[PDB]
Amino acid sequence: ASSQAWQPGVAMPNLYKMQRMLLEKCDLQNYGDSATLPKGIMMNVAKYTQLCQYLNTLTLAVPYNMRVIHFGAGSDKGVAPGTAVLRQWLPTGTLLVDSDLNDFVSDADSTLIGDCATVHTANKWDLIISDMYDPKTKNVTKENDSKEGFFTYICGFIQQKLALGGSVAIKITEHSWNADLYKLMGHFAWWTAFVTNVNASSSEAFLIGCNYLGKPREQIDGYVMHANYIFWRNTNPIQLSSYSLFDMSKFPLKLRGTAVMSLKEGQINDMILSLLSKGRLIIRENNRVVISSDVLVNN
Amino acid sequence: STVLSFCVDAAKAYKDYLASGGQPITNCVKMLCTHTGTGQAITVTPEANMDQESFGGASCCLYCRCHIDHPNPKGFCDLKGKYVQIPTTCANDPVGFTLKNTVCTVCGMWKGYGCSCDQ
Numbered sequence: 498a499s500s501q502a503w504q505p506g507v508a509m510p511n512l513y514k515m516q517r518m519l520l521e522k523c524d525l526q527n528y529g530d531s532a533t534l535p536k537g538i539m540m541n542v543a544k545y546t547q548l549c550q551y552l553n554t555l556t557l558a559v560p561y562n563m564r565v566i567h568f569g570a571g572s573d574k575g576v577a578p579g580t581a582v583l584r585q586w587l588p589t590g591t592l593l594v595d596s597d598l599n600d601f602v603s604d605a606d607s608t609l610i611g612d613c614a615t616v617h618t619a620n621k622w623d624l625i626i627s628d629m630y631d632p633k634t635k636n637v638t639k640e641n642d643s644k645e646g647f648f649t650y651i652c653g654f655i656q657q658k659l660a661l662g663g664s665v666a667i668k669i670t671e672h673s674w675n676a677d678l679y680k681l682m683g684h685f686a687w688w689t690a691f692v693t694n695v696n697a698s699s700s701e702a703f704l705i706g707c708n709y710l711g712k713p714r715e716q717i718d719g720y721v722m723h724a725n726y727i728f729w730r731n732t733n734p735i736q737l738s739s740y741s742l743f744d745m746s747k748f749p750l751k752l753r754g755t756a757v758m759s760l761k762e763g764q765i766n767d768m769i770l771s772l773l774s775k776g777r778l779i780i781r782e783n784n785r786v787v788i789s790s791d792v793l794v795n796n
Numbered sequence: 797s798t799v800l801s802f803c804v805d806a807a808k809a810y811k812d813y814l815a816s817g818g819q820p821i822t823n824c825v826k827m828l829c830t831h832t833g834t835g836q837a838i839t840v841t842p843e844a845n846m847d848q849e850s851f852g853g854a855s856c857c858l859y860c861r862c863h864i865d866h867p868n869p870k871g872f873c874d875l876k877g878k879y880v881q882i883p884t885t886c887a888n889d890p891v892g893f894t895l896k897n898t899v900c901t902v903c904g905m906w907k908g909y910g911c912s913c914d915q
C-alpha cells in the first residue's frame with residue numbers, strides 16, 4: 498500500500514495544474530472496483546467522511562453561527578447520508594440547509610425540494626457543498642464538452658451568495674464538469690481537485706475552493722484545467738482505501754470562532770485579503786437566514 | 797375531532813408488520829465514530845459506546861421515513877437533526893428499536909439498555 502493509502506484521499510499535485518493538456522478519455526486501471534468498507538457503512542457516508550477529513554487540513558473559516566448549504570443531498574434511498582456526515586462534522590448550532598430535485602428526509606435544519614434553480618436566498622454562506630450529478634451524463638454520445646444545467650446555477654450562487662473567506666466543495670466527474678467552475682477556482686486563495694480513497698476507482702473528484710477572495714487571484718482556463726485533471730487521473734492510479742475511516746478521534750471541524758465583519762467592496766485591501774487567505778475572516782452581514790423555493794403555478 | 801378520532805397508529809402497525817415476518821425498514825444512515833462515546837440514546841453528535849452503533853436520527857424515525865405526521869400537538873420530531881445510539885444486537889432494525897424503547901429523562905440512556913437509575 499502507498500503512503501497516500503492512510504490519507505482520506507489524494508489532491509491534484511501542483512505540477513499537474515501547470516500543464517496544458519488536451520482532453521483525453523478517462524481510463525482508470527481499477528475502474529469500477531469497489532472499496533472494502535467497514536461493516537454496514539454506506540459508500541456515501543465513507544465518501545463524505547473522507548471529504549470532511551480532507552477539509553480538516555485546509556484553512557477553512559469557521560465562524561460562530563456558521564452557514565452551510567448542501568446541494569444534491571438526496572439519494573434514491575430517500576435519506577441524506579452526506580447531510581448526516583456534514584452535521585456530525587460541523588460545530589453544534591451550525592445552520593445546515595440541504596436541497597435536491599427529489600424528495601428525501603434529512604437531518605438538515607431546512608430542506609428545499611426542486612431543481613437547484615428554484616432555490617433563492619438574499620443571505621451569504623460560509624461553505625457550499627454540491628454532490629449534484631445529472632443521470633443523463635452517463636449517455637456519452639457527443640464529445641466531452643463543458644456542461645451547463647446545475648453548474649450554471651452553482652457558478653452564479655458562488656459569485657452572488659458565497660461570503661468572502663468562504664469555501665466550496667463541488668462534485669465533478671470526467672463528463673460532469675464545467676469550464677466556468679474551474680475558472681472560479683482562481684477566485685479563491687487556494688484550490689484543488691480532491692479524490693476520496695474509497696472512490697479512487699471513479700473519475701469523481703471534489704473541486705475545492707479554499708477562502709473566496711471575490712476577485713481573480715490566478716487566471717484558469719477551464720477546458721485546459723479539466724484536461725489536466727484527466728491526465729493526472731489517467732497517469733496516477735490511486736489504490737482503493739478505507740483506512741482513514743477507522744480513526745474518527747479528530748473528525749469534528751475545529752471551532753476557530755473566525756471573525757465575521759461587514760465591509761464595502763472598496764474596503765477590501767491587501768491586509769483584508771491576507772486575513773481571508775488564512776481562514777481568519779468571513780465578510781457578510783449577520784442577518785436572519787431566509788431561503789425560498791420558487792413554485793410554478795399551473796392547471 | 798372526527799379526523800383526530802379516526803387517526804393511523806403507525807407505531808403498533810410496524811410491530812404487527814414485523815410480527816408477520818415483514819422485512820425491517822432499511823437505509824438507516826450508520827455513522828463512522830470512535831465508539832468511546834457517552835452511550836446516551838439521542839445526542840447532538842454520535843455518542844455510540846463499544847456496544848452501540850450511531851445513526852442519523854431522521855433516517856431512524858418511522859414518521860420521517862413514512863412521510864406521516866408525528867404524534868405530538870406540535871408534530872415535533874425527537875430524532876431529526878440528532879444521532880440515535882442503537883445496541884449493536886438491535887442495529888439491524890433502528891426504526892423498530894426507537895419505536896419500542898423510551899429514553900430516561902434523568903440520565904438520557906435508553907430504558908433497559910443503559911439506564912441504571914433504578915440501581
Ligand SMILES: C[n+]1cn([C@@H]2O[C@H](COP(=O)(O)OP(=O)(O)OP(=O)(O)OC[C@H]3O[C@@H](n4cnc5c(N)ncnc54)[C@H](O)[C@@H]3O)[C@@H](O)[C@H]2O)c2nc(N)[nH]c(=O)c21
Pocket residue numbers: 523524525526528630631632634635637670671672673696698699700701
Ligand atoms: C472514468 N470513466 C468513465 N467511463 C465511461 O464514461 C461514462 C460517464 O463517466 P462519468 O462522468 O459518469 O464518470 P465515472 O464513470 O467515473 O463516474 P461514476 O460512475 O464512478 O460515478 C461517480 C459518482 O457520481 C454519482 N453518480 C453516478 N451515477 C449516478 C446516477 N445515476 N445517479 C446519481 N448519482 C450518480 C455517485 O455519487 C458516484 O459515486 C461512464 O458511465 C463510463 O461509460 C469509463 N469507462 C471506462 N472503461 N473506464 C473509465 O475509467 C471510465
Ligand SMILES: C[n+]1cn([C@@H]2O[C@H](COP(=O)(O)OP(=O)(O)O)[C@@H](O)[C@H]2O)c2nc(N)[nH]c(=O)c21
Pocket residue numbers: 554555556557686687707708774775
Ligand atoms: C492546503 N493549502 C495549500 N496552500 C498553499 O500551498 C502552499 C503549500 O501547499 P501544500 O500542499 O500544503 O504543501 P506543503 O505543506 O508540503 O508545503 C501553502 O504554503 C499555501 O501557500 C493553501 N493556502 C491556503 N490559503 N489554504 C490552504 O488550506 C492551503
Ligand SMILES: Nc1ncnc2c1ncn2[C@@H]1O[C@H](CSCC[C@H](N)C(=O)O)[C@@H](O)[C@H]1O
Pocket residue numbers: 541568569570571572573577578579580596597598599611612613614628629630631632646647
Ligand atoms: N438540477 C438539479 N437540481 C437539484 N438536484 C439535482 C439536480 N441535478 C441532479 N440533482 C441531484 O443530484 C443528486 C446526485 S446523487 C447525491 C447523493 C447524496 N449526496 C448522498 O449523500 O447520498 C441526485 O439526488 C439528483 O436528484
Ligand SMILES: [Zn+2]
Pocket residue numbers: 854857858859860861866873874875876
Ligand atoms: Zn421524525
Ligand SMILES: [Zn+2]
Pocket residue numbers: 900901902903904905911912913
Ligand atoms: Zn436513567
